[PDB]
Amino acid sequence: LAAALAQAL
């Protein structure tokens, strides 16, 4: 999940 969100940056 962290990666799924972190893509924003």
**Quaternary structure type:** monomer
* Helix/strand order: H
Shape assignment: elongated
Distance between the termini: 14 Å
- Rg (CA only): 5 Å
- Tally of individual helices: 1
Find the count of extended strands (DSSP E, 2+ residues).
0
What percentage of the residues does DSSP assign to strands (E)? under 5%
**Structural class of the helices, strands and pairings?**
mainly alpha
Helical fraction equals 55-70%
Largest beta-sheet details:
none
Q: How is this structure best summarized?
A:
This protein is mostly helical. The chain has 1 helix and no strands.
Write structural notes for this entry.
With 9 residues, the protein is mostly helical. 56% of the residues lie in helices and 0% in strands. The chain is built from one helix and no strands.
Strand and helix layout:
Blueprint lengths: L1 H5 L3
Give keywords.
9 residues, monomer, de novo protein, 0% strand, elongated, porous, mainly alpha
